[PDB]
């Protein structure tokens, strides 16, 4: 089946107990689903967030609208909406906890591949549709082929190895040089000065 | 305020301060490079073998002949035994250097074509060049003797 | 150089070919300025450098005709853009407000009529953007938005 499967709004098995929405599941560059998986072109998530059935359905509509099933197949690598984000009663007294669940959404961090595309089609023809999807996407992303991600990784490695600075973010930070530990994050040793909250700064060399 | 809202999240002047201290400066160039300064071997071997086997080799600058004209020339050079071929000029210059030919080095320039044969059959090519008003025969080499266009015309006559 | 004599009889005659200087101390460079030891120290006031690359009617020379590097040819083109509007290059006519280094072209520059807040201020266009790494003999930073 060379088409994108439909993503349901919630699974058949529900979530009985209430749960919180932790930003750390979207924070940080994701390691899983970071490279191509039986694909030659995809969309790498250039930022963190959560995609619901609405964003997945918009992406599926935009994919099935412009695709050739005899030459281009697309498989959604992200799961269905599973994390329950709730909403309380309208015109209820403020505070006092959480009510019933509102809607499901699956959270994806930065670097995740969204839809793997393959077949007898290159990324150049689907580049326009991928750019329209990325501009309309829930989180920031970048349409990258199998070789484009490698080109970006090589460029990042070259930028890292060609640094000329007499001081680096780790060089003062992991050293805890000048008291920036009064403001340095506990998780800041992991992003190395590249992931700041919900925004992802890969452009920092 | 919220951790993540419609507005962007807050950055401390200390945070942006160290961030500017973390200015990832790219490499600083010194001299700058922009303002500073298998088929080929097989083709060369085949050209050397053709030069060694054939007694008469004629170099022409014929490019004016179309595909039909080239087919007619090939038919004429098949009726009387003359192998017509063309290779790269850069490859032929190494081929000419290996073959130790001095006078054929300046003749091979631009679009060119070699005609290598044991029996001399350049009179048919001369007649073809007479019929269609072009003079591609220039700088031939027959029996280890470099000739000119006038010498080729005299030999054809 | 060549000329086309016409009167119908038309002929093309090669006359008055130009020649280079006898002592290039910076031979085997890639930019012609690098071929002439002028890598970053060419300025928009330079009449001679302007004459060395300006066509007789003011046409732009391609880099193959120019013999300069593409970055250097763009530098030459930007210098030409600087100098023709500078009123110092009257040698290339096709057929007042005085100036000093106006980069963008006059007849489409919008009147900057909304001065922004000093925390979000847009300044006027200042200087040729091509010369960001021009050879500076000074220690002051080289301005871009005045």
């Amino acid at each position: 089946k060379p088409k994108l499967r439909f993503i349901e709004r919630a699974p058949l098995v529900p979530k009985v107990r209430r749960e919180p929405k932790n930003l750390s599941d979207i924070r940080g560059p994701s390691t899983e689903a970071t490279e191509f998986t039986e694909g030659n072109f995809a969309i790498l998530a250039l930022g963190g967030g959560y995609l619901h059935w609405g964003h997945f359905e918009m992406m599926r509509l935009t994919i099935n609208r412009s695709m050739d099933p005899k030459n281009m197949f697309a498989i959604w690598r992200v799961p269905a909406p599973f994390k329950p984000i709730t909403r309380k009663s309208v015109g209820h007294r403020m505070g006092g906890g959480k009510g019933a669940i509102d809607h499901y959404v699956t959270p994806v961090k930065a670097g995740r591949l969204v839809v793997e595309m393959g077949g007898r089609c290159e990324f150049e023809e689907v580049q326009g549709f991928l750019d329209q999807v990325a501009h309309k996407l829930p989180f920031a992303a970048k349409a990258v082929s199998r070789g484009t991600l490698e080109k970006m990784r090589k460029d990042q490695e070259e930028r890292e190895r060609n640094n000329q600075n007499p001081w680096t973010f780790e060089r003062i930070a992991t050293a805890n040089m000048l008291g920036i530990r009064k403001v340095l994050s506990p998780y800041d040793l992991t992003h190395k000065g590249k992931y700041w909250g919900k925004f992802y700064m890969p452009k920092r060399v | 305020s919220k951790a993540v809202t419609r507005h962007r999240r807050v950055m401390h002047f200390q945070r942006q301060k160290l961030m500017a201290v973390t200015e990832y400066i790219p490499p600083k160039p010194a001299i700058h490079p922009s303002c500073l300064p298998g088929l080929i071997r097989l083709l060369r071997r085949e050209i050397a073998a053709v030069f060694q086997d054939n007694r008469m080799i004629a170099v022409c600058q014929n490019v004016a002949l179309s595909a039909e004209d080239k087919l007619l020339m090939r038919h004429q050079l098949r009726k009387h035994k003359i192998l017509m071929k063309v290779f790269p000029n850069q490859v032929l210059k190494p081929f000419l250097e290996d073959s130790k030919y001095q006078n054929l080095l300046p003749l091979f320039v631009g679009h060119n074509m070699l005609l290598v044969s044991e029996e001399p059959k350049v009179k048919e090519m001369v007649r073809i060049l007479r019929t269609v008003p072009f003079l591609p025969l220039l700088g031939g080499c027959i029996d280890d003797t470099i000739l000119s266009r006038q010498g080729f015309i005299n030999y054809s006559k | 150089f060549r000329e086309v004599v016409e009167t119908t009889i038309i002929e093309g005659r090669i006359t008055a070919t130009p020649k280079e200087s006898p002592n290039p101390p910076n031979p085997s460079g890639q930019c012609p300025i690098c071929r002439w030891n002028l890598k970053h120290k060419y300025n928009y006031d330079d009449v001679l450098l302007l004459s060395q690359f300006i066509r007789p009617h003011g046409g732009m020379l391609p880099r193959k005709i120019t013999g300069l590097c593409q970055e250097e040819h763009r530098k030459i083109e930007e210098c030409v853009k600087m100098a023709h509007r500078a009123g110092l290059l009257p040698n290339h006519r096709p057929r007042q407000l005085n100036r000093y280094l106006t980069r963008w072209a006059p007849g489409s520059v919008k009147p900057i009529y909304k001065k922004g807040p000093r925390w979000n201020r847009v300044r006027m266009p200042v200087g040729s953007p091509l010369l960001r790494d021009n050879v500076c003999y000074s220690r002051t930073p080289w301005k871009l938005y005045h």
């Binding site: 007499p166 001081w167 000048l178 | 942006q16 301060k17 201290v21 | -």
Partner: peptide, 28 residues
Amino acid sequence: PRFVSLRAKQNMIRRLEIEAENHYWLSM
């Protein structure tokens, strides 16, 4: 919104180098 210019670069560079040298001589 706030930006720090090259003045911050030079004085803070004096700070960072001071701290670095203090770290350096404090290693024996």
